[PDB]
Short mmCIF file of C-alpha atoms in Angstrom, two decimals:
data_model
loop_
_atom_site.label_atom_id
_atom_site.label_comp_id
_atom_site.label_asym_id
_atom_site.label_seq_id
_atom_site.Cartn_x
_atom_site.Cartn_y
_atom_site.Cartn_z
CA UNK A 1 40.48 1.96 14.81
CA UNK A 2 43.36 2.60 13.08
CA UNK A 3 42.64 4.34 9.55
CA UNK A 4 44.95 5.62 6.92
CA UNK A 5 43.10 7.73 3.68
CA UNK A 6 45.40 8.75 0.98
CA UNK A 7 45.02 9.17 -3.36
CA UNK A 8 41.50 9.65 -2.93
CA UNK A 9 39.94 12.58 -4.87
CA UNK A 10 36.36 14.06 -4.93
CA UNK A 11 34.40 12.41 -8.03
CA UNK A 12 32.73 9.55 -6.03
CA UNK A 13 29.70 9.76 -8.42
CA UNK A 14 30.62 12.91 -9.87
CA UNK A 15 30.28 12.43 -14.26
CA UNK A 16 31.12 15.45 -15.51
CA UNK A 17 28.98 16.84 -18.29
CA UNK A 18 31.06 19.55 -20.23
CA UNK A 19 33.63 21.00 -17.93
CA UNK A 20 32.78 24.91 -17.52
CA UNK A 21 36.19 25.36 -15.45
CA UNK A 22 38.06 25.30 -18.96
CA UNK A 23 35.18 26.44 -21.22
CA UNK A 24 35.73 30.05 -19.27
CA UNK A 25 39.23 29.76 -20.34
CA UNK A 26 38.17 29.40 -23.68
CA UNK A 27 35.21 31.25 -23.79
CA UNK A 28 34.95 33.06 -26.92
CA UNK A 29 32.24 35.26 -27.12
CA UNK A 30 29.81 32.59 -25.46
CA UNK A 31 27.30 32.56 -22.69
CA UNK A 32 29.88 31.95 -20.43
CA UNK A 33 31.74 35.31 -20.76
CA UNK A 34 30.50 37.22 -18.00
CA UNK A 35 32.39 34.77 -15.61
CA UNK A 36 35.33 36.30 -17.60
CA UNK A 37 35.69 39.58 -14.91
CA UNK A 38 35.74 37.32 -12.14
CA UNK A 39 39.31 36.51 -10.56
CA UNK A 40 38.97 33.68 -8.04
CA UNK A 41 36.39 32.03 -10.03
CA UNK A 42 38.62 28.89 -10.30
CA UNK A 43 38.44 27.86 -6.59
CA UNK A 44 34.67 28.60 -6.61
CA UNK A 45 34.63 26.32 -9.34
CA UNK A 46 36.44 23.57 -7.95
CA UNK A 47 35.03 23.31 -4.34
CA UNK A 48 31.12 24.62 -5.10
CA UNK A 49 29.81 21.77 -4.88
CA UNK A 50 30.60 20.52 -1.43
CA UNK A 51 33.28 18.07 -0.76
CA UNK A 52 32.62 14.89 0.66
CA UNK A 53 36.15 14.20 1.81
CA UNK A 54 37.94 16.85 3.66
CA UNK A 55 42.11 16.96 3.91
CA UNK A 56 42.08 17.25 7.54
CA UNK A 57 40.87 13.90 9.37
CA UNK A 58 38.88 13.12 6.19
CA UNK A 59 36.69 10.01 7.29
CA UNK A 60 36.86 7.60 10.35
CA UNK A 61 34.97 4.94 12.13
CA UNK A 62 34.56 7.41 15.17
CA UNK A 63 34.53 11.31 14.24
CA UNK A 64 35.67 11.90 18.01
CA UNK A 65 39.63 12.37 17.57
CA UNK A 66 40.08 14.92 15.44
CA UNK A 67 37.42 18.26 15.17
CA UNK A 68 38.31 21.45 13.01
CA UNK A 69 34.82 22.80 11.81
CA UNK A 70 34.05 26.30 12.00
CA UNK A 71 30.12 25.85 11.67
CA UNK A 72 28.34 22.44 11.52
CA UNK A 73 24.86 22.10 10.84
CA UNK A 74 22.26 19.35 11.47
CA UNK A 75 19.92 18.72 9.24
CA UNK A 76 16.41 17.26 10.19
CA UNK A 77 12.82 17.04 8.89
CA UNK A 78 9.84 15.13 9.47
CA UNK A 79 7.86 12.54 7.28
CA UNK A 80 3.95 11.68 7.43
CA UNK A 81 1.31 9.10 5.92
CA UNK A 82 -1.23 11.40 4.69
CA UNK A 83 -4.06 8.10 5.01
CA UNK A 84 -3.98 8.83 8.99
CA UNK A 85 -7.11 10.28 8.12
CA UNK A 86 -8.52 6.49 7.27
CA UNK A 87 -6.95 5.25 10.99
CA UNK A 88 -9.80 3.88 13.48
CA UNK A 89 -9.83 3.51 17.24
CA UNK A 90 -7.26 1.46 19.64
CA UNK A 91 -8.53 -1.68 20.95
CA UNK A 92 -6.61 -2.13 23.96
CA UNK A 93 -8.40 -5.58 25.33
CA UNK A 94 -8.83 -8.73 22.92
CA UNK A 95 -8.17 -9.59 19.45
CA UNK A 96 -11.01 -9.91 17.27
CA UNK A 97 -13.65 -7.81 15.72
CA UNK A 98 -17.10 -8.91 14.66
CA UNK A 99 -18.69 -6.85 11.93
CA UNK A 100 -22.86 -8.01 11.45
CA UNK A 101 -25.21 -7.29 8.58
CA UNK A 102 -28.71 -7.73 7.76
CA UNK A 103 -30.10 -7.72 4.49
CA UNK A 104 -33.45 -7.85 2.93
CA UNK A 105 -36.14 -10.80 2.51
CA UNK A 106 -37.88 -11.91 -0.74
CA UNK A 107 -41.47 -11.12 -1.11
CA UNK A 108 -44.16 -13.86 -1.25
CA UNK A 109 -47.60 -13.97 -3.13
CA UNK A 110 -50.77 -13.80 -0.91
CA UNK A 111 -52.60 -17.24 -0.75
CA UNK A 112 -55.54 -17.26 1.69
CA UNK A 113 -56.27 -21.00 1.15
CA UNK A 114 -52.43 -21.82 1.59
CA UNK A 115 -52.41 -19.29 4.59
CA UNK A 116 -54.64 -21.82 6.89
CA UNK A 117 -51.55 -24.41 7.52
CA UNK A 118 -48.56 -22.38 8.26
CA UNK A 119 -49.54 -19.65 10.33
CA UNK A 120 -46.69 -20.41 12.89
CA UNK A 121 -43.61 -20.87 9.89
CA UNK A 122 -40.48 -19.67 10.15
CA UNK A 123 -38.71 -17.64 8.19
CA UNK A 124 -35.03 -16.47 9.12
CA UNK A 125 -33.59 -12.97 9.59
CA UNK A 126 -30.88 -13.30 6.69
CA UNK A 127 -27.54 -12.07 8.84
CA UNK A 128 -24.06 -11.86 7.45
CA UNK A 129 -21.04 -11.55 9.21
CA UNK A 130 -17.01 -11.04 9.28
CA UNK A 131 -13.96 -11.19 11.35
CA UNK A 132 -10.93 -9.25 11.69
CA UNK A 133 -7.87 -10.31 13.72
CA UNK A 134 -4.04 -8.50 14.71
CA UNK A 135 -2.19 -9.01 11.60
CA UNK A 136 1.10 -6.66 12.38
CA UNK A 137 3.52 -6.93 15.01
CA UNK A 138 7.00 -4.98 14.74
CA UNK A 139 9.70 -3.00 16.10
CA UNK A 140 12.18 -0.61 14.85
CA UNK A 141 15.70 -0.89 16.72
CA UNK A 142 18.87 1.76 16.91
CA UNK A 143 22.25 2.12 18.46
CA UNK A 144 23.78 4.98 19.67
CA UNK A 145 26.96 5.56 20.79
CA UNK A 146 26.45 8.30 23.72
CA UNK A 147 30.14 8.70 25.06
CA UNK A 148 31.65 7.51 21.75
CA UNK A 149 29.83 10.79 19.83
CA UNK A 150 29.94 12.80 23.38
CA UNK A 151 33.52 13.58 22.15
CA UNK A 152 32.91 14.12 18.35
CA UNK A 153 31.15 17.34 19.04
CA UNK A 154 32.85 20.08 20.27
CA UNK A 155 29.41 21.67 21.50
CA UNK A 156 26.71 20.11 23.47
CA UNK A 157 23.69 21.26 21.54
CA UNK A 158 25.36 19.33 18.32
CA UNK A 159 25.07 16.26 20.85
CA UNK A 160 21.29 16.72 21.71
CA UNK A 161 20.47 17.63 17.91
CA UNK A 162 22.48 14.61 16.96
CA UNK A 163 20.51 12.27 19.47
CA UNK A 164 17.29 14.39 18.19
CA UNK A 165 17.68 13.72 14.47
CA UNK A 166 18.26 9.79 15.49
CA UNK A 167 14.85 10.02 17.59
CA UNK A 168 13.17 11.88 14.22
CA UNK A 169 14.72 9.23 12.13
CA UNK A 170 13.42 6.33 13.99
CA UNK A 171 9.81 7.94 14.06
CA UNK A 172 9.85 9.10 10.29
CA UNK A 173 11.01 5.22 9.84
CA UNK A 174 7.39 4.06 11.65
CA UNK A 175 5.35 6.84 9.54
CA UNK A 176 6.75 5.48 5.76
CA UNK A 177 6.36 1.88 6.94
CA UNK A 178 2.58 2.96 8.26
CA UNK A 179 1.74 4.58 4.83
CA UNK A 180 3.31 1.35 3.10
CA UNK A 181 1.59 -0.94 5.05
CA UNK A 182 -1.91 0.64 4.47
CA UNK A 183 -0.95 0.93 1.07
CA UNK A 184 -0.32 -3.00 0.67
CA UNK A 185 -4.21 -3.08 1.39
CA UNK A 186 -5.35 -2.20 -1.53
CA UNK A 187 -3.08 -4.05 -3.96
CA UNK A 188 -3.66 -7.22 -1.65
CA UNK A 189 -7.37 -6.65 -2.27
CA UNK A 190 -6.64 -6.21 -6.05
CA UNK A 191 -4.79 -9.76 -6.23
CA UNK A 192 -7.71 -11.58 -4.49
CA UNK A 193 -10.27 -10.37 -7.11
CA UNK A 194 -12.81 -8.74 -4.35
CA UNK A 195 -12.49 -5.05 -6.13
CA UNK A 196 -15.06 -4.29 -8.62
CA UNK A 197 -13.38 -3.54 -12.47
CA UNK A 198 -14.15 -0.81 -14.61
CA UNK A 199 -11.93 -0.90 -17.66
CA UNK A 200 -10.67 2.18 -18.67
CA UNK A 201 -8.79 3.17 -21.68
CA UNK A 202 -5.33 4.91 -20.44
CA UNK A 203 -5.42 8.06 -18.18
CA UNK A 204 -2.89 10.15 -19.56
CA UNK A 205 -2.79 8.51 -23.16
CA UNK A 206 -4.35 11.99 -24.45
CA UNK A 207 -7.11 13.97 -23.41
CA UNK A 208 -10.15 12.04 -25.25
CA UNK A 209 -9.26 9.40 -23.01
CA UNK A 210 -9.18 11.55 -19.92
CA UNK A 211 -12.21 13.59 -20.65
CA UNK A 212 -13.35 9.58 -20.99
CA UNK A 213 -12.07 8.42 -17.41
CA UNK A 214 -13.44 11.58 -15.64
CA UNK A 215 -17.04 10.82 -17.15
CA UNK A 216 -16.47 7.12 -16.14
CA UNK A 217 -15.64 8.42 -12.47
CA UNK A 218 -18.29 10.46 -12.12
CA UNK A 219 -21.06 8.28 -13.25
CA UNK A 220 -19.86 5.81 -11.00
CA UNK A 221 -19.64 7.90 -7.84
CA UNK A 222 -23.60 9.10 -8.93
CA UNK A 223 -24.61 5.15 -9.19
CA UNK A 224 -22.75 4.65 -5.88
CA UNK A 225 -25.12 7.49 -3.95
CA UNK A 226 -28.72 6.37 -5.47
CA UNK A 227 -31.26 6.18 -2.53
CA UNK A 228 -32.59 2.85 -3.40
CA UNK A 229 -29.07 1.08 -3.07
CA UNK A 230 -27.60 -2.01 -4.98
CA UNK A 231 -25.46 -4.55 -4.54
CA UNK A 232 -22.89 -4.83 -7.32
CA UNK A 233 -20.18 -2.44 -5.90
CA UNK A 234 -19.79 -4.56 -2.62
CA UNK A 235 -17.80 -7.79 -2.46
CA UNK A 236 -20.37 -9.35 -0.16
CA UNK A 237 -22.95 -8.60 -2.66
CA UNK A 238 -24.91 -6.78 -0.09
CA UNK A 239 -27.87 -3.98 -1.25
CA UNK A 240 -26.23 -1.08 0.53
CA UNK A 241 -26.16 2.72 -0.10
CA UNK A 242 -22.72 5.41 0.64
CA UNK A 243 -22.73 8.68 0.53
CA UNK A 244 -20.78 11.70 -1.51
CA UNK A 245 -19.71 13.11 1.78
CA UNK A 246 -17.81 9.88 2.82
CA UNK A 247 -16.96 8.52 -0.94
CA UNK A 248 -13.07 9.26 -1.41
CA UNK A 249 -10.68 8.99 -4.52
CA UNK A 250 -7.07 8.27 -4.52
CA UNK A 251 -4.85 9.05 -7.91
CA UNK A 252 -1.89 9.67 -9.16
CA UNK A 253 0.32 12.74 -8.95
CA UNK A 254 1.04 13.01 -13.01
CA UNK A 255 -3.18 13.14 -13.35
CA UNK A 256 -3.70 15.50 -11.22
CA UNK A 257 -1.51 18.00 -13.23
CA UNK A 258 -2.71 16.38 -16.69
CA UNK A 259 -6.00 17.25 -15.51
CA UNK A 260 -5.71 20.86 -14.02
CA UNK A 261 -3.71 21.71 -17.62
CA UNK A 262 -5.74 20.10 -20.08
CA UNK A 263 -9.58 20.62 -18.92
CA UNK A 264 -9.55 22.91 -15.87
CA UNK A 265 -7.43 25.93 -17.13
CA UNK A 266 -9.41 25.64 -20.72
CA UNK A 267 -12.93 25.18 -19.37
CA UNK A 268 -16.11 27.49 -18.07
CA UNK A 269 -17.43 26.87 -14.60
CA UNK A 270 -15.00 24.01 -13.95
CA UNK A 271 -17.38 22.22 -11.63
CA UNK A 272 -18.70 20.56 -14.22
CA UNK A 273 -15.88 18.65 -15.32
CA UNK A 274 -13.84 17.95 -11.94
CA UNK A 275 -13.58 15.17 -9.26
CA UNK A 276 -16.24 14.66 -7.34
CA UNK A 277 -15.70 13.10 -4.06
CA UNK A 278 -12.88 13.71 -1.48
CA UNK A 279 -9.66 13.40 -3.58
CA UNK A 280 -6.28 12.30 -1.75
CA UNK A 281 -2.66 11.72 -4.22
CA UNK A 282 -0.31 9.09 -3.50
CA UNK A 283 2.65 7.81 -5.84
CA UNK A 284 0.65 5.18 -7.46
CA UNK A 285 -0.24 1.52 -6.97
CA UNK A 286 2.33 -1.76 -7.54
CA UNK A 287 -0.22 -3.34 -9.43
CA UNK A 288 0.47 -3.66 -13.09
CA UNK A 289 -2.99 -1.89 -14.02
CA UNK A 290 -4.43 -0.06 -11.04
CA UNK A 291 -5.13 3.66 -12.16
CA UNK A 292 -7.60 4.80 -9.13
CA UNK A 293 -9.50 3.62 -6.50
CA UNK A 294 -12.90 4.65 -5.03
CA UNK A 295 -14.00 3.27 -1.72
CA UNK A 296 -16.30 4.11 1.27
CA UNK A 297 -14.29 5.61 4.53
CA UNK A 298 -15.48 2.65 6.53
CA UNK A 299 -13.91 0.64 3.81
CA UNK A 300 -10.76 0.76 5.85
CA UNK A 301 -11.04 -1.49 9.39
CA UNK A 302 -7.67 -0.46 10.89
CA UNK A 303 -6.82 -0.34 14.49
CA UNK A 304 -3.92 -0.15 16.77
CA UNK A 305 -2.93 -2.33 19.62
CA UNK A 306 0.50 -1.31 20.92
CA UNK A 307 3.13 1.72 20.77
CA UNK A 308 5.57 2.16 22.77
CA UNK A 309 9.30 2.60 23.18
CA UNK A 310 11.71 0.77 25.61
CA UNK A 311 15.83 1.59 26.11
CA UNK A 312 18.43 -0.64 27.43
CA UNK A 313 22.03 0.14 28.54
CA UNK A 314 24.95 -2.03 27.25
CA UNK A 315 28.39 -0.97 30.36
CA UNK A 316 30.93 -2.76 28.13
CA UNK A 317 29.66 -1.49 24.67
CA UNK A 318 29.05 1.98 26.87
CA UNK A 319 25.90 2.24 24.16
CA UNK A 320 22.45 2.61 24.49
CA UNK A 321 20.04 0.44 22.53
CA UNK A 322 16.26 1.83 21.47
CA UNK A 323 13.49 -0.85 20.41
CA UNK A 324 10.26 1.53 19.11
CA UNK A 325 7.44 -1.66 19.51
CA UNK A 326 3.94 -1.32 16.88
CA UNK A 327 1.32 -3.77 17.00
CA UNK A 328 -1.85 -2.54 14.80
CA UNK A 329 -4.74 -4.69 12.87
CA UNK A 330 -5.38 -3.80 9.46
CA UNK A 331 -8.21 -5.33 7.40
CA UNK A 332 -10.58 -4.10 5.04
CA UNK A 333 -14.35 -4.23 5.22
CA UNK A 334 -16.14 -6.14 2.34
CA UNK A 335 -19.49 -4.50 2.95
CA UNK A 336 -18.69 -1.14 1.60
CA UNK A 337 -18.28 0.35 -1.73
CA UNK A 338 -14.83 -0.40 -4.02
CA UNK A 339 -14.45 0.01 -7.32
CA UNK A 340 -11.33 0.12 -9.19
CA UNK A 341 -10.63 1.62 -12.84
CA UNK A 342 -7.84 -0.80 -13.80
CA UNK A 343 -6.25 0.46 -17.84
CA UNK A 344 -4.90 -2.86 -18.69
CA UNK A 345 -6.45 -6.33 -20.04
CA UNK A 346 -9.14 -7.59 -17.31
CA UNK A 347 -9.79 -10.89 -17.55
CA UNK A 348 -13.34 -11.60 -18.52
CA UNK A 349 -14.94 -12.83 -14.58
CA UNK A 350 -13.11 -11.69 -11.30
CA UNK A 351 -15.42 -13.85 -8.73
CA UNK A 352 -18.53 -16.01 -7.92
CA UNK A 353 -20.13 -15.10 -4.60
CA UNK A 354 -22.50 -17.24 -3.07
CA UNK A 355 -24.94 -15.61 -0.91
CA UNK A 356 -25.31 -18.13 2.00
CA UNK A 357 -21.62 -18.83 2.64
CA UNK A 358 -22.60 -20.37 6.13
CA UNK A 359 -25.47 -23.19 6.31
CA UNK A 360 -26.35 -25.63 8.90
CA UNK A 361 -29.10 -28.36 7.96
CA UNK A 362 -30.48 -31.38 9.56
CA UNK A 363 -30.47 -35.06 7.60
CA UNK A 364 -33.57 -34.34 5.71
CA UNK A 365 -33.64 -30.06 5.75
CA UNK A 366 -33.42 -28.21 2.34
CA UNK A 367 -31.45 -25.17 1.55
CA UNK A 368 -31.54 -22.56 -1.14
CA UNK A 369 -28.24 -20.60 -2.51
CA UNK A 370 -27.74 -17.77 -4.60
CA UNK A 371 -24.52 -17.17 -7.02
CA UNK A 372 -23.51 -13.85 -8.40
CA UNK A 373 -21.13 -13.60 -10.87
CA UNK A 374 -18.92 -9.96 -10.90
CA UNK A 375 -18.45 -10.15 -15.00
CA UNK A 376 -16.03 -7.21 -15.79
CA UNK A 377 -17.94 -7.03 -19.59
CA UNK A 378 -21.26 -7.75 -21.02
CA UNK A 379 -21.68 -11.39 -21.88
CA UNK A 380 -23.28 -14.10 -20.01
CA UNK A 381 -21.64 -16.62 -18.30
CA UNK A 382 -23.72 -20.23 -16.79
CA UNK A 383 -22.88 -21.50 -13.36
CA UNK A 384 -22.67 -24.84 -12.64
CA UNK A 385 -23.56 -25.77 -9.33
CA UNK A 386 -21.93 -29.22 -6.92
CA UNK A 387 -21.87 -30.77 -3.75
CA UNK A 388 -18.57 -32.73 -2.11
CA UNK A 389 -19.63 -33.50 1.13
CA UNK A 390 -18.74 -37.20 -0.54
CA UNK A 391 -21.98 -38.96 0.67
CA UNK A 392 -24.31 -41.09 -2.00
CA UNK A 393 -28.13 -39.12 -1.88
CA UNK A 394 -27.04 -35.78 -1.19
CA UNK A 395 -28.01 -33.64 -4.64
CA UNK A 396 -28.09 -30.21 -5.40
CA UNK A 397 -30.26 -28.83 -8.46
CA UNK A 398 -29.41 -26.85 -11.11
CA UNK A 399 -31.16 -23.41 -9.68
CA UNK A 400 -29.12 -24.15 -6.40
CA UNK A 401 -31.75 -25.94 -3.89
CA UNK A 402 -29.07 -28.44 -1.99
CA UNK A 403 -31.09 -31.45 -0.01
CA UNK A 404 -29.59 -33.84 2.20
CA UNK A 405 -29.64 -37.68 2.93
CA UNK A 406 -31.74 -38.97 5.78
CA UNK A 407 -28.27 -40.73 6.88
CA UNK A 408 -24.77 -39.08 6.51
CA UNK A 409 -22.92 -37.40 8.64
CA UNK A 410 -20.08 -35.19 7.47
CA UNK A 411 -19.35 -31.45 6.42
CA UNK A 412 -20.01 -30.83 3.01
CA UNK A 413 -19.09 -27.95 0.62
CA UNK A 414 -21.10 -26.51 -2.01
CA UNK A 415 -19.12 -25.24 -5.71
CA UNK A 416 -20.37 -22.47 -8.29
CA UNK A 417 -18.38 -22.48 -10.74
CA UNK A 418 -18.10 -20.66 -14.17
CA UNK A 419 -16.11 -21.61 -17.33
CA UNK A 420 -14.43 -18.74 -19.33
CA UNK A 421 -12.00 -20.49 -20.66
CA UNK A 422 -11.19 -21.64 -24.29
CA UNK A 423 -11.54 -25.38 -25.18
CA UNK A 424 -8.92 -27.86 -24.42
CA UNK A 425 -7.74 -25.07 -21.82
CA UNK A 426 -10.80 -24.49 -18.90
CA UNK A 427 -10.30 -21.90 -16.94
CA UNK A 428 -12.81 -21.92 -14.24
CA UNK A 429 -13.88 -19.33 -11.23
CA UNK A 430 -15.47 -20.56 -8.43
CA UNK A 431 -17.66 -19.74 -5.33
CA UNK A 432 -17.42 -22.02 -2.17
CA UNK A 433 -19.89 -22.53 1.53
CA UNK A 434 -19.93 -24.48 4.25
CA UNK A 435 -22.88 -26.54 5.25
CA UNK A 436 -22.47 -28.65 8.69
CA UNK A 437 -25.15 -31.12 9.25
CA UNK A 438 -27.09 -32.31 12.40
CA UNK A 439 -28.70 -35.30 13.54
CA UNK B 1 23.05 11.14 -15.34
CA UNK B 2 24.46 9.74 -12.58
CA UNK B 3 24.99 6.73 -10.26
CA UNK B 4 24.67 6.64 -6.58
CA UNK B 5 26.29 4.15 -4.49
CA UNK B 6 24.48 4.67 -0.51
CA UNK B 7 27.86 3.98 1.75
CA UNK B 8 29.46 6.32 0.05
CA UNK B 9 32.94 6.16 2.69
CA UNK B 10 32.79 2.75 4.76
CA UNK B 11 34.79 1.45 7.47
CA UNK B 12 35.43 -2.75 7.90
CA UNK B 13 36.93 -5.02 9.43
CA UNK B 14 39.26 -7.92 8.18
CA UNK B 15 36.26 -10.55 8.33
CA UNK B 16 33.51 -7.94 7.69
CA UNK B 17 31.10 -7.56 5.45
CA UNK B 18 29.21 -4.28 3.74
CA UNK B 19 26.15 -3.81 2.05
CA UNK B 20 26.03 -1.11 -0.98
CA UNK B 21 22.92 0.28 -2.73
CA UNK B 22 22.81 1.88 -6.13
CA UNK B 23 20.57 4.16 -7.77
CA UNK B 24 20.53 5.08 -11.02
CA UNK B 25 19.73 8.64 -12.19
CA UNK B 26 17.82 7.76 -15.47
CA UNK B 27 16.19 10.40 -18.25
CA UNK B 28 14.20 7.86 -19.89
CA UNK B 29 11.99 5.14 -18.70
CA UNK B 30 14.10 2.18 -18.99
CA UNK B 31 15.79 0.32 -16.60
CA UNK B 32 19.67 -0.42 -17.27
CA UNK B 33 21.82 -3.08 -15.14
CA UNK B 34 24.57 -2.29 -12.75
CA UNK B 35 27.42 -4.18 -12.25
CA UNK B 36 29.62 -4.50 -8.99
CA UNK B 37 33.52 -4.54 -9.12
CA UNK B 38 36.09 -3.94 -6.48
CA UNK B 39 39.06 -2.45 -7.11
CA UNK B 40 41.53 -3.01 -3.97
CA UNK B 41 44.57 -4.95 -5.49
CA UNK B 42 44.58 -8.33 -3.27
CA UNK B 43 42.65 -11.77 -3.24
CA UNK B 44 40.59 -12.85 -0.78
CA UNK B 45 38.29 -9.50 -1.26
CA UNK B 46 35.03 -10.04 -3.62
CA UNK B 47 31.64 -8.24 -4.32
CA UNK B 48 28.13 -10.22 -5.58
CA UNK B 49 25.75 -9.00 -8.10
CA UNK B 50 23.75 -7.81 -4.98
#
């Protein structure tokens, strides 16, 4: 409590480039001689810049002592996410959410003779489903000093915009961590492979390639609106359809100018060469070669569980303590649309997805599974299909019909996997489901 | 350009400890590696690379 300043000066981080305070001195027919007329141009010189340290009670632990300030100012502005647009619901009651999906059936060949024996088979309804859980739970805490700082302002309405900027800070504190956290979604998404690749050249290399990545954009957002549907932009491999009206792009801020200089102020009817769905700018992804990202809006799956804001009182500290509590889910949904145009050096498969991730069979039942295999390029890859339940008469073939024993009882797993790797050096990718079996 | 240290004036105790951030004001795209000293006059007073 006791603190003594002296030889201190004013160049904390101050590195002076040229020193105009003597250039006007010896300014000789330069630039810098109509600062010449100007008398007290020396003091304007020295203390423009605003001093960080001033000669009367300079700096202190507790500005409360000592007050000579003809005008103080407080300074205080306000920060936002702008993806609160992609924010859900609340889910005040329980924890998990259960997201179901049909999908089509194959079509059979008409057999009248065949027909006479199996009027009363089965056939089942080929469902699909996912979970989300509450994956955030936080708090943001802060200290103030209320009869400590009472003192340090002269005024009261310093002391309420003091407290006020402290209340702003902690909520501006909760927005940036909301817009990181819903950022982290996508890169997380990224490092687990379920994105689907399109390789792109460089953005802002020169304007070939970006005339290149806006026709690779666009013809992707057409194939991702066709009536008839497909599944190779989905990560459950799900036939599914979006729309234009609810397809949204997210970029960089440098493209957005490179783009509105380059092709926009140089081109007729611009339409024709400009983003097409909803387009939203952030300051880029972590990831080393994430460029942009097009997804569904019911591609994001967050929700929020708690928010609210508790004090407490500490007598001998005479302080006041603030905890600011958020509890939110946030999840993705891997039966909608996302693609991502990545600029760097893809490797050659991203994931094996087998359609039936979910089985349950009886000791003699048969089942049938499907593998698709995202391939970033256009060569063709062979998967190789196993079964490590660990029981002797339990086979699968090589088309990926599994059939079980007549007598073992445990839960096996059933492996696609494809090789892309050199010789000497495999590198393998590899789909995984779950088959439980019954007596 | 310029670097920044955060805590620009800090107040301590004998047995404290601070924490100081620095950012670098940089024209190109490289990175370039600060180094920490402390220039009080007395042992018993050091700094990390952090």
């Amino acid at each position: 409590m006791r603190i003594t300043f002296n030889d201190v000066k004013t160049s904390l981080g101050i590195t002076e480039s040229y020193d105009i305070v003597n250039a006007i001195r010896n300014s000789q027919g330069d630039n810098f001689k109509s600062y010449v007329p100007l008398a007290t141009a020396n003091n304007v010189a020295e203390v423009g810049a605003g001093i960080l340290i001033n000669q009367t009670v300079q700096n202190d632990f507790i500005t409360s002592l000592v007050d000579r300030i003809g005008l103080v100012v407080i300074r205080q502005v306000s920060l936002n996410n702008p993806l609160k647009k992609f924010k859900k619901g609340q889910i005040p009651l329980g924890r998990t959410i259960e997201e179901i999906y049909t999908d089509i059936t194959k079509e059979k060949q008409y057999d009248a003779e065949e027909a006479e024996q199996k009027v009363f088979e089965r056939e089942m309804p080929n469902v699909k489903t996912l979970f989300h859980e509450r994956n955030r739970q936080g708090f943001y805490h802060q200290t103030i000093q209320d009869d400590s700082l009472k003192t340090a302002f002269v005024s009261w309405g310093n002391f309420e915009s003091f407290v006020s900027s402290i209340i702003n800070a902690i909520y501006n504190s909760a927005e940036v961590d909301e817009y990181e956290y819903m950022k982290l979604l996508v890169d997380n998404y990224y490092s687990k492979g379920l994105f689907t690749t399109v390789k792109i050249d460089e953005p802002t290399s020169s304007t070939g390639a970006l005339t290149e990545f806006v026709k690779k954009m666009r013809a992707t957002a057409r194939k991702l609106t066709l009536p008839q549907g497909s599944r190779d932009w989905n990560s459950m491999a799900v036939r599914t359809r979006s729309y234009m009206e609810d397809l949204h792009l997210i970029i960089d801020a440098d493209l957005e100018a490179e783009l509105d200089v380059d092709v926009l102020a140089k081109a007729f009817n611009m339409n024709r060469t400009d983003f097409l769905g909803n387009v939203t700018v952030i300051d880029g992804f972590a990831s080393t070669g994430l460029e942009a990202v097009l997804v569904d809006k019911d591609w994001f799956m967050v929700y929020d569980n708690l928010h609210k804001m508790e004090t407490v009182r500490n007598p001998r500290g005479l302080y006041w303590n603030y905890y600011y509590h958020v509890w939110q889910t946030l999840s993705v949904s891997r039966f909608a649309n996302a693609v991502a145009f990545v600029s760097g050096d893809v490797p050659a498969v991203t994931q094996v997805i087998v359609s039936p991730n979910i089985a349950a069979v009886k000791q003699g039942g048969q089942q049938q599974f499907t593998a698709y295999v995202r391939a970033t390029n256009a060569k063709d890859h062979k998967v190789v299909w196993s079964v490590e339940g660990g029981s002797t008469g339990t086979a699968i073939t090589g088309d990926g019909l599994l059939s079980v024993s007549g007598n073992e009882d445990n839960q096996l797993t059933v492996k696609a996997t494809v090789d892309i790797g050199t010789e000497d050096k495999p590198k393998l990718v590899v789909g995984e489901a779950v088959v439980s079996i019954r007596p």
